Design a protein around this ligand. Structure first.
Ligand SMILES: O=C(O)c1c[nH]c(=O)[nH]c1=O
Length: 229
C-alpha cells in the first residue's frame, strides 16, 4: 500500500505518475524513511495513504498551485492537501482561519461552512506543501529528509507543460520553488505565510485569489472559481 511497496502508476493520477517518473526512486526512498520512523517509535502526518493526495487530481487540469511549507502538526488536521482539513474539523487551524479572512477580504464571499478545500483541488488548484510529512507537534521536523526533490520535480513538470500556470508561494520554503517558474508561461505570487507568526508581515492584504485570476485571464486561461460553500 505504501510508496515503498507500490509504483507511482498505482499511488497517483496517470498524468502525475509520468510527471514524477524522474523521482520514482526518491518517492520509494521516502517510503523507507517513514517505515524507519515507525520502526523507531516516532509518528508522522498525514496518514500514509494521504501523503501523495495532492497528485490524485489530474496533472493536465492544474491551472494554479498553492505551496505551503509542511503539513499541519496536530493529529486530526492534515489530509494530504495543503491547508485543508476534513469537513468535520472545528475549530479551524489558525493558518486556515487567516486564509479565510484574506479570502473574504479579497473576494467578498462569506466565511466557508467548513475547512475542506477539496473544491479548489477539483477546480484545477494543486494544494502542495514543499515537504509532504511532519512529526506530530514538531513543525518542519522532516525538512531536508528527501521531499524537496519530489516537490521540485512536480513544479518543474507543471512548468514544462504547454499551458499557462500561476503559483502562489506562501513562506520561505515555498519560495525556493521560484527559480523553476522562470519560463514565460509561468508567473509566481510570493507572500509571507498565513501562520500567525508571519501573516501580519504581508499575508493579510496580499489578494492572492483575485491576482491569480487576473494573471490567468491575461494569459488566456479560465479563472479559478474560488467560491467555497
Ligand atoms: O501552518 C503551516 O505551516 C502549514 C500548515 N498546513 C499546510 O498544509 N501547510 C503549511 O504550510
Amino acid at each position: 500500500a505504501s510508496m515503498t511497496a507500490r509504483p507511482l502508476s498505482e499511488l497517483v493520477e496517470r498524468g502525475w505518475a509520468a510527471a514524477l517518473e524522474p523521482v520514482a526512486d526518491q518517492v520509494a526512498h521516502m517510503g523507507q524513511f517513514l517505515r524507519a520512523e515507525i520502526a523507531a517509535g516516532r509518528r508522522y502526518l498525514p496518514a500514509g495513504s494521504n501523503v501523495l493526495r495532492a497528485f490524485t487530481f489530474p496533472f493536465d487540469n492544474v491551472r494554479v498551485l498553492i505551496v505551503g511549507q509542511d503539513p499541519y502538526p496536530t493529529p486530526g488536521h492534515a489530509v494530504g492537501l495543503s491547508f485543508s482539513v476534513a469537513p468535520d474539523v472545528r475549530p479551524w487551524p489558525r493558518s486556515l482561519a487567516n486564509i479565510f479572512d484574506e479570502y473574504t477580504a479579497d473576494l467578498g464571499y462569506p466565511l466557508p461552512s467548513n475547512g475542506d478545500l477539496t473544491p479548489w483541488a477539483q477546480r484545477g488548484v494543486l494544494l502542495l506543501n514543499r515537504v509532504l510529512t511532519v512529526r506530530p507537534s514538531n513543525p518542519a521536523s522532516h525538512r531536508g529528509k528527501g521531499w524537496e526533490a519530489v516537490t521540485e520535480c512536480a513544479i518543474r513538470a507543471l512548468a514544462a507543460r504547454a499551458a499557462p500556470l500561476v503559483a502562489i508561494l506562501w513562506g520561505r520554503d515555498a519560495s525556493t520553488l521560484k527559480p523553476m517558474l522562470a519560463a514565460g508561461n509561468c508567473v509566481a505570487i510570493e507572500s509571507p505565510h498565513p501562520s500567525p507568526l508571519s501573516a501580519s508581515r504581508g499575508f493579510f492584504g496580499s489578494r492572492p485569489f483575485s491576482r491569480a485570476n487576473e494573471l490567468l485571464v491575461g494569459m488566456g486561461a479560465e479563472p479559478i472559481d474560488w467560491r467555497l460553500p
